[PDB]
Design an enzyme around this catalytic site. Structure first.
Site, PDB file in Angstrom:
ATOM      1  N   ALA A  91       3.492   3.988  -0.868  1.00  0.00           N
ATOM      2  CA  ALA A  91       4.657   3.814  -1.710  1.00  0.00           C
ATOM      3  C   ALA A  91       5.325   2.426  -1.589  1.00  0.00           C
ATOM      4  O   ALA A  91       6.214   2.112  -2.386  1.00  0.00           O
ATOM      5  CB  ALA A  91       5.658   4.938  -1.431  1.00  0.00           C
TER       6      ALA A  91
ATOM      7  N   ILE B 175       7.171   1.158   1.086  1.00  0.00           N
ATOM      8  CA  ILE B 175       8.530   1.210   1.665  1.00  0.00           C
ATOM      9  C   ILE B 175       8.501   1.427   3.178  1.00  0.00           C
ATOM     10  O   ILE B 175       9.296   0.827   3.874  1.00  0.00           O
ATOM     11  CB  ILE B 175       9.471   2.232   0.946  1.00  0.00           C
ATOM     12  CG1 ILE B 175       8.998   3.699   1.115  1.00  0.00           C
ATOM     13  CG2 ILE B 175       9.611   1.826  -0.551  1.00  0.00           C
ATOM     14  CD1 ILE B 175       9.841   4.746   0.314  1.00  0.00           C
ATOM     15  N   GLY B 176       7.584   2.264   3.672  1.00  0.00           N
ATOM     16  CA  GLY B 176       7.572   2.590   5.112  1.00  0.00           C
ATOM     17  C   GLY B 176       6.940   1.542   5.991  1.00  0.00           C
ATOM     18  O   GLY B 176       7.609   0.734   6.654  1.00  0.00           O
ATOM     19  N   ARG B 177       5.605   1.547   6.019  1.00  0.00           N
ATOM     20  CA  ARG B 177       4.856   0.524   6.745  1.00  0.00           C
ATOM     21  C   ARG B 177       5.184  -0.876   6.183  1.00  0.00           C
ATOM     22  O   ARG B 177       5.372  -1.833   6.960  1.00  0.00           O
ATOM     23  CB  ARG B 177       3.359   0.745   6.724  1.00  0.00           C
ATOM     24  CG  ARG B 177       2.951   2.079   7.329  1.00  0.00           C
ATOM     25  CD  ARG B 177       1.436   2.145   7.332  1.00  0.00           C
ATOM     26  NE  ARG B 177       0.979   3.505   7.484  1.00  0.00           N
ATOM     27  CZ  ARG B 177      -0.288   3.889   7.489  1.00  0.00           C
ATOM     28  NH1 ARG B 177      -1.255   3.007   7.377  1.00  0.00           N
ATOM     29  NH2 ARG B 177      -0.593   5.163   7.607  1.00  0.00           N
TER      30      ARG B 177
ATOM     31  N   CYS C 202       0.843  -1.191   0.000  1.00  0.00           N
ATOM     32  CA  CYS C 202       0.000   0.000   0.000  1.00  0.00           C
ATOM     33  C   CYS C 202       0.884   1.248   0.000  1.00  0.00           C
ATOM     34  O   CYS C 202       2.085   1.121  -0.032  1.00  0.00           O
ATOM     35  CB  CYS C 202      -1.028   0.009   1.114  1.00  0.00           C
ATOM     36  SG  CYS C 202      -2.390  -1.129   0.818  1.00  0.00           S
TER      37      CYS C 202
ATOM     38  N   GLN D 147      11.213   3.685   6.974  1.00  0.00           N
ATOM     39  CA  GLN D 147      11.362   5.101   6.641  1.00  0.00           C
ATOM     40  C   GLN D 147      11.809   5.956   7.830  1.00  0.00           C
ATOM     41  O   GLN D 147      12.637   6.869   7.638  1.00  0.00           O
ATOM     42  CB  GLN D 147      10.017   5.661   6.090  1.00  0.00           C
ATOM     43  CG  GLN D 147       9.810   5.292   4.620  1.00  0.00           C
ATOM     44  CD  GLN D 147      10.731   6.089   3.756  1.00  0.00           C
ATOM     45  OE1 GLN D 147      10.545   7.307   3.629  1.00  0.00           O
ATOM     46  NE2 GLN D 147      11.735   5.439   3.149  1.00  0.00           N
TER      47      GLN D 147
END
Ligand code: A1H4T
Length: 502
Positions: free
Chosen positions: A435, A437-439, A433, A480
């Site tokens: 981008a 990369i973070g979650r 979901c 991130q």
């Protein structure tokens, strides 16, 4: 390579550095150290200094009046080869990185550490060529390079201590060159190792590993890091992202530009998912913004973005081709009134075709932290290709920051794990979901770490930053923020504690 990031500088110090030691086109980046995921890009232009905000709420670096990026190193690379403007629209040029001399974010820098402590650490954890630099206690202001050498297979190994003098802001080992910073010195003696009179080469091969811990001693490490040591460990990890500027040429192709949620957040070529068997009448049909994540490169992942309307068909092609049977979504469809993960599945009980793929939503089941959708995916015209894909939609992650308690994430990952384990020959678990990369990076890293502990028990070694660096080599900027970094430690701690409670 990333000396332009100054972790401990103030805004005024940044202006004075640019005005006194820089020229027009000089730049540096720095944190707002009180406030989470605020950074500033400070740039000299026409003899004055501009400050540009970069925000990271957890999903990407958002440069004010610019674009969104997966890492600050990818941000700097992009504008140093391209585009950056003021509020009034004037071009700001990033020409000359203004290099930091501060050693605190270097893997080899231990600061206050005694010679006996350095010998004990190098003895227990070190091997040949392991080294560290520490503050001198006998000669304040000076430093010591401590290096282990020997046979790694009883006196066959030793530790040597080399005094580093500071004399007028320059550093030396008692003769020869005088260096403008410890890093320059360490880099020099890394390429050109010191030799002892009787022949031993003081090879600086790797920093001493201080982050690998036994899982049983997680609570103690978190206690020490919460005295704030999480910040320094995280910024030492961030310093090494300049080693991960791998090519993303496929994502940059004209034909693929509108297949990316953000034009500059792109999959590495060497790990991207390649789509086969596309429409021969589309010139470029092999591309999706997704990467295979293979830990220590059984369970693997695909980390990907939320769909765009024009990539939903490609997403289903990917799930089918890779034999994925479990999808994790990390965001609601909409947060803060903005689309974060576009709906790509049918309403409950309905059937839809997505190009050559057919999806039935068999049943939805709501739990407190997530919704499960039992989907049946098949290729149109080929009934016997049907397989169930279990979609786990996490719905309680806060709009900013990270969950205050990791229990919900951990219970969810436990269920996702058992589902995956129940299906013979299931392919990689898709996590996505926003981008991607973070979650997505956070969920994947937690899952990797908790899987080691699940199979090996409390009595096994884990290394949080080393694991993250390994995943970040497979997709840009996986994990991130410092808040997600601390959340991974908290999730591992809580998992270890609940397993001691049982
Ligand atoms: N400045 C110091 C911060 C504390 C305290 C001593 C040492 C250096 N220490 C440290 C060491 N190593 C790491 C890593 C790391 C571990 C494995 C691989 C890679 Cl690539 C990295 Cl960057 C991330 N954070 C660290 C912190």
């Amino acid at each position: 390579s990333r000396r332009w990031f100054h972790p401990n500088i103030t805004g005024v110090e940044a202006e004075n550095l640019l005005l006194t030691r820089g020229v027009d086109g000089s730049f540096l980046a720095r944190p707002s150290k009180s406030n989470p995921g605020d950074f500033t890009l400070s740039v000299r232009r026409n003899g004055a200094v501009t400050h540009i905000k970069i925000q990271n709420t957890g999903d990407y670096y958002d440069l004010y009046g610019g674009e969104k990026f997966a890492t600050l190193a990818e941000l700097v690379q992009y504008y140093m080869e391209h585009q950056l403007k003021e509020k009034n629209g004037d071009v700001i040029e990033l020409k000359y990185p203004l290099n930091c001399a501060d050693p605190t974010s270097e893997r080899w820098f231990h600061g206050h550490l005694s010679g006996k402590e350095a010998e004990k650490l190098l003895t227990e954890k070190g091997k040949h060529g392991s080294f560290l630099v520490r503050e001198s206690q006998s000669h304040p202001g000076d430093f010591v390079l401590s290096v282990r050498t020997g046979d790694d297979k009883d006196g066959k190994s030793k530790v040597t201590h080399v005094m580093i003098r500071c004399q007028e802001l320059k550093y030396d080992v008692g003769g020869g060159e005088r260096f403008d910073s410890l890093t320059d010195l360490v880099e020099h003696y890394k390429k050109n190792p010191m030799v002892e009179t009787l022949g031993t080469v003081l090879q600086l091969k790797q920093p001493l590993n201080t982050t690998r811990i036994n899982a049983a001693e997680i609570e103690s490490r978190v206690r020490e890091l919460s005295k704030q040591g999480f910040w320094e460990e995280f910024e030492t990890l961030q310093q090494q992202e300049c080693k991960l500027l791998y090519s993303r040429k496929e994502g940059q192709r004209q034909e693929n530009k509108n297949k990316n949620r953000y034009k500059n957040i792109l999959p590495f070529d060497h790990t991207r998912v390649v789509l086969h068997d596309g429409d021969p009448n589309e010139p470029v049909s092999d591309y999706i913004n997704a990467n295979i994540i293979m830990p220590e490169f059984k369970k693997s992942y695909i980390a990907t973005q939320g769909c765009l309307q024009n990539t939903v068909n490609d997403f289903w092609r990917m799930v089918f081709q890779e034999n994925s049977r479990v999808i994790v979504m990390t965001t609601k469809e909409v947060e803060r009134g903005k689309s974060k993960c576009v709906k790509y599945w049918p309403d409950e009980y309905a059937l839809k075709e997505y190009g050559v793929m057919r999806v039935r939503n068999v049943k939805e089941s709501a739990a407190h932290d997530y919704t499960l959708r039992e989907l049946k995916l098949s290729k149109v015209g080929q009934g016997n290709t049907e397989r169930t894909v279990w979609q786990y939609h996490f719905r309680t992650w806060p709009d900013h920051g990270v969950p205050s308690d990791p229990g919900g994430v951990l219970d969810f990952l436990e269920e996702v794990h058992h589902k995956q384990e129940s299906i013979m020959d299931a392919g990689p678990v898709v996590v996505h979901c926003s981008a991607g990369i973070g979650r997505t990076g956070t969920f994947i890293v937690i899952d990797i770490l908790i899987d080691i502990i699940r199979e090996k028990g409390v009595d096994c070694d884990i290394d949080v930053p080393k694991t993250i660096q390994m995943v970040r080599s497979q997709r840009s900027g996986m994990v991130q923020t410092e808040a997600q970094y601390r959340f991974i430690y908290m999730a591992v701690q809580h998992y270890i504690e609940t397993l001691q409670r049982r």
